[PDB]
Design a binder for this molecule. Structure first.
Ligand SMILES: *[C@@H]1O[C@H](CO)[C@@H](O[C@@H]2O[C@H](CO)[C@@H](O)[C@H](O)[C@H]2NC(C)=O)[C@H](O)[C@H]1NC(C)=O
Ligand SMILES: *[C@@H]1O[C@H](CO)[C@@H](O[C@@H]2O[C@H](CO)[C@@H](O)[C@H](O)[C@H]2NC(C)=O)[C@H](O)[C@H]1NC(C)=O
Ligand SMILES: *[C@@H]1O[C@H](CO)[C@@H](O)[C@H](O)[C@H]1NC(C)=O
Lengths: 57, 50
């Protein structure tokens, strides 16, 4: 939504463009648009849902 | 100077005029071909007209 995906080697974070403040990638950091066959350079990672744990407990 | 992949730089340039990023990524080849042909047209215009 605002920022850029980065990786310190192992885990994928989403930061703001002008200052390294990494954040877990969740569905509120990111927005869905399209699918995986059209983008060039798309990677595989896990997007955390802030809602699923609440439903679970 | 902070390096950044040119496709992502163009994504920022698109997101700066009110067009989301996915527009570029889903239309990256189209935009690249349009830019290349535009530069070719610039060459033709400068070479034909003084
Ligand atoms: C990249 O950063 C992540 C976390 O920001 C590092 O993973 C953590 O490593 C510590 C140390 O063992 C663990 O206690 C955490 O549980 C890890 N977090 C996760 C989510 O796995 C990771 O080691 C860093 N990678 C490099 C190459 O430095
Ligand atoms: C990222 O995940 C996708 C699936 O979500 C992987 O796509 C697989 O690609 C292989 C190689 O062509 C196919 O045999 C599989 O059938 C694909 N999976 C599906 C569900 O269709 C893709 O390979 C993954 N990429 C990386 C780098 O791990
Ligand atoms: C980046 O370029 C390398 C070649 O140097 C290529 O193997 C790789 O697929 C490219 N990745 C992207 C996302 O363009």
């Amino acid at each position: 939504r605002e920022g850029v995906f980065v990786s310190n080697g192992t885990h994928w974070f989403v930061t703001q463009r002008n200052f390294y403040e990494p954040q877990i990638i969740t569905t509120d950091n990111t927005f869905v648009s399209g699918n995986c066959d059209v983008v060039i350079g798309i990677v595989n990672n896990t997007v955390y849902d802030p809602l699923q744990p609440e439903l679970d407990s | 100077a902070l390096q950044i992949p040119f496709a992502m730089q163009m994504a920022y340039r698109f997101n700066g005029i009110g067009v989301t990023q996915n527009v570029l990524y889903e239309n990256q080849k189209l935009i690249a071909n349009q830019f290349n042909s535009a530069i070719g047209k610039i060459q033709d215009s400068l070479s034909s007209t003084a």
